[PDB]
Design an enzyme around this catalytic site. Sequence first.
Site, PDB file in Angstrom:
ATOM      1  N   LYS A 164       0.817  -1.205   0.000  1.00 27.93           N
ATOM      2  CA  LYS A 164       0.000   0.000   0.000  1.00 27.93           C
ATOM      3  C   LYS A 164       0.857   1.263   0.000  1.00 27.93           C
ATOM      4  O   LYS A 164       2.031   1.223   0.365  1.00 27.93           O
ATOM      5  CB  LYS A 164      -0.892   0.045   1.246  1.00 27.93           C
ATOM      6  CG  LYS A 164      -2.000  -0.997   1.317  1.00 27.93           C
ATOM      7  CD  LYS A 164      -2.770  -0.860   2.645  1.00 27.93           C
ATOM      8  CE  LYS A 164      -3.913  -1.863   2.745  1.00 27.93           C
ATOM      9  NZ  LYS A 164      -4.910  -1.672   1.652  1.00 27.93           N
TER      10      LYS A 164
ATOM     11  N   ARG B 166     -10.668 -11.504   1.423  1.00 27.47           N
ATOM     12  CA  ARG B 166     -11.490 -12.541   0.803  1.00 27.47           C
ATOM     13  C   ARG B 166     -10.821 -13.899   0.913  1.00 27.47           C
ATOM     14  O   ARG B 166     -11.498 -14.931   0.971  1.00 27.47           O
ATOM     15  CB  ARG B 166     -11.877 -12.187  -0.640  1.00 27.47           C
ATOM     16  CG  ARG B 166     -10.786 -12.251  -1.693  1.00 27.47           C
ATOM     17  CD  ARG B 166     -11.272 -11.540  -2.950  1.00 27.47           C
ATOM     18  NE  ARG B 166     -11.183 -10.090  -2.794  1.00 27.47           N
ATOM     19  CZ  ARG B 166     -11.524  -9.192  -3.718  1.00 27.47           C
ATOM     20  NH1 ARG B 166     -12.047  -9.588  -4.865  1.00 27.47           N
ATOM     21  NH2 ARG B 166     -11.376  -7.896  -3.473  1.00 27.47           N
TER      22      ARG B 166
HETATM   23  C1  LIG Z   1      -9.812   0.418   2.299  1.00 24.03           C
HETATM   24  C2  LIG Z   1      -9.530  -0.897   2.965  1.00 24.03           C
HETATM   25  C3  LIG Z   1     -10.757  -1.390   3.698  1.00 24.03           C
HETATM   26  C4  LIG Z   1      -8.852  -1.938   2.068  1.00 24.03           C
HETATM   27  C5  LIG Z   1      -8.847  -3.353   2.630  1.00 24.03           C
HETATM   28  N1  LIG Z   1      -8.108  -3.391   3.899  1.00 24.03           N
HETATM   29  C6  LIG Z   1      -8.139  -4.302   1.620  1.00 24.03           C
HETATM   30  O1  LIG Z   1      -7.846  -5.546   2.211  1.00 24.03           O
HETATM   31  O2  LIG Z   1      -6.834  -3.769   1.355  1.00 24.03           O
HETATM   32 ZN   LIG Z   2      -5.731  -5.528   1.796  1.00 23.14          ZN
END
Ligand SMILES: CC(C)C[C@H](N)C(=O)O
Ligand SMILES: [Zn+2]
Lengths: 484, 484
Positions: free
Chosen positions: A262, A336
């Site tokens: 990220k 997921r």
């Molecule tokens: C904006 C977030 C809720 C993104 C989320 N953590 C995804 O697994 O990276």
């Molecule tokens: Zn994530």
Amino acid sequence: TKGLVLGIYSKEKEEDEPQFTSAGENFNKLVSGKLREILNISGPPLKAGKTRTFYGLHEDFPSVVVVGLGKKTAGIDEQENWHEGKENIRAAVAAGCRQIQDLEIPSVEVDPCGDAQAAAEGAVLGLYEYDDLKQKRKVVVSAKLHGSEDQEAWQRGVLFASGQNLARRLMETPANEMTPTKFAEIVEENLKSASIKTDVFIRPKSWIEEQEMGSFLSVAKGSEEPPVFLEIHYKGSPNASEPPLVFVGKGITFDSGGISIKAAANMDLMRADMGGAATICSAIVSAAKLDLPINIVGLAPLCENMPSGKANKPGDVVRARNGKTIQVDNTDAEGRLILADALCYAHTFNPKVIINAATLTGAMDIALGSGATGVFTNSSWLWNKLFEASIETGDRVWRMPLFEHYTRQVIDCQLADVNNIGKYRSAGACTAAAFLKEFVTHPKWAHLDIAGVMTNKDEVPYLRKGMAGRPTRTLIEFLFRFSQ
Amino acid sequence: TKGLVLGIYSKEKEEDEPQFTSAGENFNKLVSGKLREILNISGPPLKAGKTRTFYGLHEDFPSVVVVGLGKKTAGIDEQENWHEGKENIRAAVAAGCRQIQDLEIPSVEVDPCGDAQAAAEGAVLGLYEYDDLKQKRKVVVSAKLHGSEDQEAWQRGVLFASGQNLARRLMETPANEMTPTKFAEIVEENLKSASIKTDVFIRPKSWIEEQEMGSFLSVAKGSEEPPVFLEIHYKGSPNASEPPLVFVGKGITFDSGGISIKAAANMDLMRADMGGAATICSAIVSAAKLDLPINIVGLAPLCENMPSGKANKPGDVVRARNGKTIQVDNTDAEGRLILADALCYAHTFNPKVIINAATLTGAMDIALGSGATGVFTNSSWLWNKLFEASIETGDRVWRMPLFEHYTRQVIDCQLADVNNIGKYRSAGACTAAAFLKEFVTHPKWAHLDIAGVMTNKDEVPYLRKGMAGRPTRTLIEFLFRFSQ
Ligand SMILES: CC(C)C[C@H](N)C(=O)O
Ligand SMILES: [Zn+2]
Ligand SMILES: CC(C)C[C@H](N)C(=O)O
Ligand SMILES: [Zn+2]
Ligand SMILES: [Zn+2]
Ligand SMILES: [Zn+2]
Ligand SMILES: [Zn+2]
Ligand SMILES: [Zn+2]
């Protein structure tokens, strides 16, 4: 010494002056009309959510804060899908309580404002603040009901709000403190204090490996922090064999994104990527405090998503508990992956309904923001129960589509049965939900994407800036109505 | 010479072989069982959407394409919110027709497949292709109904599909050809050919200036291409004084973004930023061909959004027709600016309902993609009528929230009454809709954000790659049901 928060409604057309609540009119009488006289002298009338402080009116209450309640007969708002009256009360009481806190008064008595549960929710949600790690803190305020009539409604409100506040604390806490093990231990102690009819299992890595949860394991391995699979049981039904309602929550204690790393900006907010686990677990603690006569099971896979020499690599193929293969095209679509295994496991309890919650996609925030939680479900009956509950709590839900159109974009996969990111960037929350459906065969399943209601700046008047703990109260209300 | 498309259903459990449609079984008889025999020899049975071609079965039909229709009794699918049977038919017929086209056959006869309107929609939508500007083109195929029974249903289908195809042509056409003036002239000629009970006014810049449409003008000025405000009237009601239903469409013939310039990648697709205008106008043309007994008014502000020495500058404040001021923080949020003026003007017709359509936000595409059109409305009655219509056409709609929560983010404005982009980047489609609501006082208004259904790659089987023209048929169906 002691503060007092009193409510006043907006003046109706054929009235000569705005009307106080029952407690307000009585207080005015106790001080021989002094409250009405000073309010009249002070200026404009008080509108919804506004406050004004009056000093020295009574020796027991040196500071009296009057709050605007809006229109007295505000009921269900068809445009907003909520009970407006309750929302006005929660916001007005929170504002009053904070003024008392700024004055550094340790205790406040609160006007029930025609709905003690909502007044209690405003005071308890309104005063909350996570400041365990700071030297400079605001005064601790003890809020209690003014009067002795309808104490059960007041207490119901404290219960609901305390449930949401626990979810907020769990979410706000820095990840180096709120690790998978620590989260599990805190939840365990809260559930056990709530009821003796509970069993908690903080399942270790070896158990996870025995359960063939290769998808969940692929995510956890990148980090040095040990993963745990939290399983909680609340045996509230008179009949022990009664099938349970199962709740599942995404528990990523920290999401860096992994190899698909990220950007730095605001990445600290990812310490709340365990919000799904925090909300469903707090909901079960509250249901347990309420001794609801229903059996409930809570499941929460917990781990960190970090980059390292052993982390998930883009393109890797992992096997879920049910044998389906998944191509991990983007390591930041990790929720997921862990949920695939938790949802498969949920079927082993032969549940009545399956509800999972997750701070899953940035797309959900882009879709609805903090206005409502997105709900994807294969059961309109279930959608309706969650929707009705939300109207009462004010912590809104909005239905999102579970169409095969989206499933097609995740099963079109180069190397495996299903891809962890869609072919296109459109409808991110819908394709993520479609991915989860491949691991569900139950007739009553609902997926709640709470990424957009993770935080609060100022959207919800009664919540200070920070992690929101939404939609805990809607979950509690749903369980309450279900038990009746 | 002439081709033939025949349908076959999937075999049901207690059947000995998959069943042909009425036309299929009859054809088989005409060729003494030769069709069934060759299909049996060819291999596996045909599943939904699949096709197979057989040669020399009859001297009049040297090429016969059999198409899989799926399950015969497929009706309304509760999961998908559509009539599955109709969707199977549209997709299967499109596939059959294209195989006939690849064979270079100029004419095809089509099996009604138990629902001639849907079969017609599949053939007409399926064969369409915008190739006016190419030297290399596919053969032009004339599709007609096989048989003489239920000709009205077939023709209804050709009408609906032709309406959507016009919207596709208008959207696909390059912007240097599809200018504001050209679009207006094409629509005018199509409406006038459809009915003599029509009036069209291609209002010029001086009229726009007289109407005090400063918001619409601020957008247009950056470009050298003259703006026009298209106004169309269809007087189909027996009572001329009967209040009209008003439709409004965003007509940006090309969106570069202006000073807040867009990135180069795929910017060519912005030639379809007039999709809102294309869909509502095509819907009115079709309603007019159908001679629906209702009065309808169509409004479409049209212009280009370009960067130049006289373009909108970030921070500029413009005055809408209704006197409200708008701070133009981002010049690429231009649709809500032109729509503010068009929606104000719509009230002058004292309409029964107001429906606007616009390829408005990238956020809508991120929200639902091409799965469904997002509908924001202050009327549940209206939502329900649009929803019911979509179940029949298969061109789905999904409701999105119109909450004050979003309005707050656009009225919090530094210099003016309302800001053209929200305080936060979350819920882009919801805040855009909230912005539009500030220019609407009508009790039955619906806003359709069609940005996500602007194009088709392969999501809708019966539409080739390109601009989709969605949701034209849902709009036509709504008007049809409304007139009855
Ligand atoms: C904006 C977030 C809720 C993104 C989320 N953590 C995804 O697994 O990276
Ligand atoms: Zn994530
Ligand atoms: C994605 C697009 C529909 C964006 C839209 N044209 C906006 O005015 O820039
Ligand atoms: Zn945390
Ligand atoms: Zn995550
Ligand atoms: Zn065009
Ligand atoms: Zn734009
Ligand atoms: Zn645009």
